[PDB]
Amino acid sequence: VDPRAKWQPQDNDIQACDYWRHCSIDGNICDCSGGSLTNCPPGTKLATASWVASCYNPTDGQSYLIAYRDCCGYNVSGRCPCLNTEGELPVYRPEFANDIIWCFGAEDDAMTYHCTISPIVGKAS
Amino acid sequence: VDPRAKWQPQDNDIQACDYWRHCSIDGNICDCSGGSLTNCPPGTKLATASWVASCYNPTDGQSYLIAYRDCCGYNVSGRCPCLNTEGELPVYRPEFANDIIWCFGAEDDAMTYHCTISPIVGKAS
Amino acid sequence: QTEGQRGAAEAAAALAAGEADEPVILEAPAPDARRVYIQDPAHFAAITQQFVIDGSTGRILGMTDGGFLPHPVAAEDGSFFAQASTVFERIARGKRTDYVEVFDPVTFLPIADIELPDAPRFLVGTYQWMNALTPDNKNLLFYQFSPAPAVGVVDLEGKTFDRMLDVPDCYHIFPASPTVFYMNCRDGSLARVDFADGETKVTNTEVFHTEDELLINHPAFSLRSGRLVWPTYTGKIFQADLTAEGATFRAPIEALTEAERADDWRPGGWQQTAYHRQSDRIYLLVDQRDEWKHKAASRFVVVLNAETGERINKIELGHEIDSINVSQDAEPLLYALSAGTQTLHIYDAATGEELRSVDQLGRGPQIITTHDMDS
Amino acid sequence: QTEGQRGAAEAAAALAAGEADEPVILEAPAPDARRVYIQDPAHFAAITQQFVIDGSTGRILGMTDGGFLPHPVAAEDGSFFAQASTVFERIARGKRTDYVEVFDPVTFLPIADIELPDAPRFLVGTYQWMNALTPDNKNLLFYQFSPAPAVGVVDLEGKTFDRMLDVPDCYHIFPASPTVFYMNCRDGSLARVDFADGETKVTNTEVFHTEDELLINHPAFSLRSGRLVWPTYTGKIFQADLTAEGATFRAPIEALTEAERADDWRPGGWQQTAYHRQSDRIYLLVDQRDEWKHKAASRFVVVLNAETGERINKIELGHEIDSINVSQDAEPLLYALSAGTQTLHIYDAATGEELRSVDQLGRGPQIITTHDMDS
Amino acid sequence: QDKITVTSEKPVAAADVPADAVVVGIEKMKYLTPEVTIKAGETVYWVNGEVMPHNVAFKKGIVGEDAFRGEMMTKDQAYAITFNEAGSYDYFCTPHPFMRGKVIVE
Amino acid sequence: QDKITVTSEKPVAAADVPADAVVVGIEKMKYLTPEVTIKAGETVYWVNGEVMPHNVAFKKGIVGEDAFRGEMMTKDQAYAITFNEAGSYDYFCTPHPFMRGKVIVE
Ligand SMILES: [Cu+2]
Ligand SMILES: [Cu+2]
Numbered sequence A, B: 001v002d003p004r005a006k007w008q009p010q011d012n013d014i015q016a017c018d019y020w021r022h023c024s025i026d027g028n029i030c031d032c033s034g035g036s037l038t039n040c041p042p043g044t045k046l047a048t049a050s051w052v053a054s055c056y057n058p059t060d061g062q063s064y065l066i067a068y069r070d071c072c073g074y075n076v077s078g079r080c081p082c083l084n085t086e087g088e089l090p091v092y093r094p095e096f097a098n099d100i101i102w103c104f105g106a107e108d109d110a111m112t113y114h115c116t117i118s119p120i121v122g123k124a125s
Numbered sequence C, D: 001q002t003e004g005q006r007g008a009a010e011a012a013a014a015l016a017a018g019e020a021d022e023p024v025i026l027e028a029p030a031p032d033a034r035r036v037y038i039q040d041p042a043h044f045a046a047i048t049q050q051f052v053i054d055g056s057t058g059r060i061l062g063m064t065d066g067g068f069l070p071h072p073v074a075a076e077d078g079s080f081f082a083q084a085s086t087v088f089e090r091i092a093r094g095k096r097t098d099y100v101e102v103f104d105p106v107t108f109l110p111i112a113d114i115e116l117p118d119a120p121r122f123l124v125g126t127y128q129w130m131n132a133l134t135p136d137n138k139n140l141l142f143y144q145f146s147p148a149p150a151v152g153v154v155d156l157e158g159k160t161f162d163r164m165l166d167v168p169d170c171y172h173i174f175p176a177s178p179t180v181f182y183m184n185c186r187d188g189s190l191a192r193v194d195f196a197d198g199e200t201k202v203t204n205t206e207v208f209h210t211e212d213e214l215l216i217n218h219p220a221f222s223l224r225s226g227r228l229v230w231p232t233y234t235g236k237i238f239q240a241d242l243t244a245e246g247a248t249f250r251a252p253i254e255a256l257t258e259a260e261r262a263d264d265w266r267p268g269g270w271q272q273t274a275y276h277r278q279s280d281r282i283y284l285l286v287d288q289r290d291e292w293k294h295k296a297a298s299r300f301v302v303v304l305n306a307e308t309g310e311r312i313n314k315i316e317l318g319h320e321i322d323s324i325n326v327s328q329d330a331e332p333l334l335y336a337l338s339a340g341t342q343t344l345h346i347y348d349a350a351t352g353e354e355l356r357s358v359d360q361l362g363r364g365p366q367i368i369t370t371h372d373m374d375s
Numbered sequence E, F: 001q002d003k004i005t006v007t008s009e010k011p012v013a014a015a016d017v018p019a020d021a022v023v024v025g026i027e028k029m030k031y032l033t034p035e036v037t038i039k040a041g042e043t044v045y046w047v048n049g050e051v052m053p054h055n056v057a058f059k060k061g062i063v064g065e066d067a068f069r070g071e072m073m074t075k076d077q078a079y080a081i082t083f084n085e086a087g088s089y090d091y092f093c094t095p096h097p098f099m100r101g102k103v104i105v106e
Helices: C003-016 D003-016
Strands: A026-028 A051-056 A063-068 A070-072 A081-083 A113-116 A120-123 B026-028 B051-056 B063-068 B070-072 B081-083 B113-116 B120-123 C035-040 C048-054 C059-066 C071-074 C081-090 C093-103 C110-116 C139-144 C150-155 C160-166 C170-177 C180-185 C190-194 C201-204 C227-231 C236-242 C247-249 C265-267 C273-276 C281-288 C298-305 C311-321 C323-326 C333-338 C343-348 C354-358 C367-369 D035-040 D048-054 D059-066 D071-074 D081-090 D093-103 D110-116 D139-144 D150-155 D160-166 D170-177 D180-185 D190-194 D201-204 D227-231 D236-242 D247-249 D265-267 D273-276 D281-288 D298-305 D311-321 D323-326 D333-338 D343-348 D354-358 D367-369 E004-006 E022-027 E035-038 E043-048 E077-083 E087-092 E100-105 F004-006 F022-027 F035-038 F043-048 F077-083 F087-092 F100-105
Touching: A026 A113, B026 B113, C035 C071, C059 C081, C071 C367, C081 C139, C081 D081, C110 C150, C110 C160, C139 C170, C227 C273, C273 C323, C281 C323, C311 C333, C311 C343, C323 C367, D035 D071, D059 D081, D071 D367, D081 D139, D110 D150, D110 D160, D139 D170, D227 D273, D273 D323, D281 D323, D311 D333, D311 D343, D323 D367, E022 E035, E035 E043, E077 E100, F022 F035, F035 F043, F077 F100
Parallel strands: E022 E043, E035 E100, F022 F043, F035 F100
Antiparallel strands: A026 A081, A051 A063, A063 A120, A070 A113, B026 B081, B051 B063, B063 B120, B070 B113, C035 C048, C035 C367, C048 C059, C071 C081, C081 C093, C093 C110, C139 C150, C150 C160, C170 C180, C180 C190, C190 C201, C227 C236, C236 C247, C265 C281, C273 C281, C281 C298, C298 C311, C323 C333, C333 C343, C343 C354, D035 D048, D035 D367, D048 D059, D071 D081, D081 D093, D093 D110, D139 D150, D150 D160, D170 D180, D180 D190, D190 D201, D227 D236, D236 D247, D265 D281, D273 D281, D281 D298, D298 D311, D323 D333, D333 D343, D343 D354, E004 E077, E043 E077, E087 E100, F004 F077, F043 F077, F087 F100
């Protein structure tokens, strides 16, 4: 309700902008367009690189780094749009900057934003 | 309010879908994106041909044929979208069919829909 | 349980166990009689999208990007789905390119990209059967409007453009066999075009309607059985069973009752006609409207016997709907799409109740397509 | 009287007299200090739009089509406006093409279309000064991120691609002269790049901030005066007057009060910084927010003296706004744009009251650009 | 580029048509005189009798390599084309493809 | 196509790295040993000591006509490249262009 209020993560709906692994996602959630929380939708290409972010998990009190790799090669999905910036850094500090199109390494050179996946790279701590 | 209720024309606001010359317009009103009621916006191309329609004018009780020529070469304006079908005929009767992209004759072969103009071709009667 | 809920629980567990996340590119389940496609013209946007959805659950399997007012088609047996699209050198301007693409049905990868010489696509609001695949799925037929009526033959097997067939002042295409399809003409009749053996021979059936009887732009049709169902702005319905030898019209059925037609009932919307093949039933979108408000949405669907013309049901949608169609499986689903809210509504064909909805489908979703593979 | 009302009356009269309708293609009035451009990234859509608006009246003069996350620029004297765009062979996939276009300022016709070798554009959310035109308007400078930091030189006079300049791990571009511009680097300093006479010589000013001090992605800047205004997530503002010889930093001004900063006040949004050149005033978008909600919208703008750091006003927008900028004329207008409602709001810079709004601007309008030509 | 010579770009008034010229009327959505034949160097005038806008058009390669499109005509307006070469020139209406006619020049 | 030979596509465990090999650690957003020099035919192992994903990459024309991009590594993972030719190979991190290092082969 209050766009200016603090993040309140949940672990009960991966398609809600406030799901906990989305604490720094920019764009659209791949689960809502054929992919899954951690996989890309058919026809699209999987980036291997991306901006990351340590995101707290209310279910286990732990914190993990999420690699927000993009699914590219398609026009933006337009479904489940979200934007979170927990610890999001400015562009001269790319590793944590999310206005960037993280399509680097996707098959056939896809550079167009379609949606973002929220896989865990491991424990942040 | 009732999308299924009869057309009630006005002659007081050319940017309202119910202005009287729009009685059979499909798309967007060129006045809302740089053109005018009868002219195209800069950078776009003026079709010379189009679907027409006899439209009643409440101000003078008369009726005139409007040539709904399209302004092409741009992506749809997205401003002042409207759709009216007074006397609109099916596609095997093109002269009155408005799902067609009436860009024929526009400079440099522009065939993409941007908006529609509502000039009078003369008195229908 | 919700989709995003089931997903969450799923992931929470993978996390409890070791189970690391190994990001991969998915494949869509196999095509079935319950899959549905929602093309989205997006009110004449220069590019557009189509969503592939599992009707039994309302879950999106994947998507497809298309250009300007593209036309979708789907081989009834599910071996694939294609589209005829148009792109430009600079977004909406410059060198135009019309082409056809064929997509693998599970990988959604473009297994064919065939350019159409001289940008011959009829740029027009999309109507279901303005394009079609021969029943043997070896060709795709599309219509050219200007400079003159013509049908283009696209060879899907050899992945190339065949040629243009010259035809009369007729519109829409309805295949009946590998080399024969019919079109609705300006003169009040249907045209029968045989394009076999490198040549085209045109014929005209008898006139089956008057200049006062307006056939809508959205006729239903079944490539499998040959049944064509075409209404008029009033709900009067001329059928015909296309064969190859020719068209055999049937006795016109009034979809609405003189009492209804008495109280302004009239069909309205976009894709307002549905023909369930295996059952021989017809679905028509309707509401009480002015006679010149035939493109507004409707809030009801009438079901009736295609042979007797007797009403079977009158479903109340509960929403402003613009297009419909049904799944060809034995226990069909009724698809009700609203371009106004970009939401698809799914009902039980038999009961008429809403089971689930799927929203956020583009800017103005308008065309529904399915595979007739069930039986 | 409304716009569509004035238009109606106008036409009703032409009709009363003889005055037939002779459809023609318009030309936009001459560029002035009150014209504003609204680029619309549209949340990463493959194609996008930019609207050209007369700020004094809120009337749209025309539009411009662009591709993927294009970057707009406008020669301060109004001789033209351009953009660096990206297109693909098949909507969002296939052979990529990055290019630059220069538009006549009144006909909006593309008088130049220069391709950029090896698709070198940094595909990223658009920030005002990530690209720039030399002050002599003879070149356009853009940034490449991967495989390595680089600045591309586009020759607008000879309508061709010059070359790529190799630069340090720095971002953004701020020209100060025909062959010198500055970039903000990862190391905490600014890089001064001279690209004159076919070669590039890089220098680094001293560090002017710590790793704890986060410079936002939206710094303000004036090509005419050389003033650069850069905040941090907290509203602290480092200035610098770029010259060519080098950058001369000024004493940092806290845009917010310890009492405000005491009550969660922090800058937030997209393009949150505005510098009115002729007046030496600064406008910063701000509201009370969590520290990690720096991209949400703000409902207030603070104005202050660029030399004293003393507050001049605190305007209440009345809407969730994401971007701002002002017109450089002596009686500047304050532009407040909301991507959430795709509506631009226009206020009197001096009084802070809203004069007029212009809506239906794309899917998520975010960048505002003007001409500094007044004086 | 032109086996034809268009006198004026803008349609002329029905009245100014020389009352001794070859005239192809247009009404009820048709060119009233489908096929008309003249001599190399002569001039055919088209006259639209209704409000429905109509015109004369040729596909590419017919009247030359480049396709040609006359301007539109509304009620009581005319448009003229002089055919400078012997040949059989097929034509149609731009927005109305179902409208065709021809000019055989000898 | 390859003056280099990649043993495995998927990163290996830090533990399996032969404790007698050339090792370029990675931490704090840097290749800890910027420039390393070996001999034609030898093998360099890269080891990431943090969670931040990192990798080794080359622009086109460096390690051959086609550009090359190793897979990513997370904490305690390694990646190996065997340089089969004498030369000076510059490299960087894919998502992190500000991270560079080199391999001088003799
Ligand atoms: Cu005509
Ligand atoms: Cu790295």
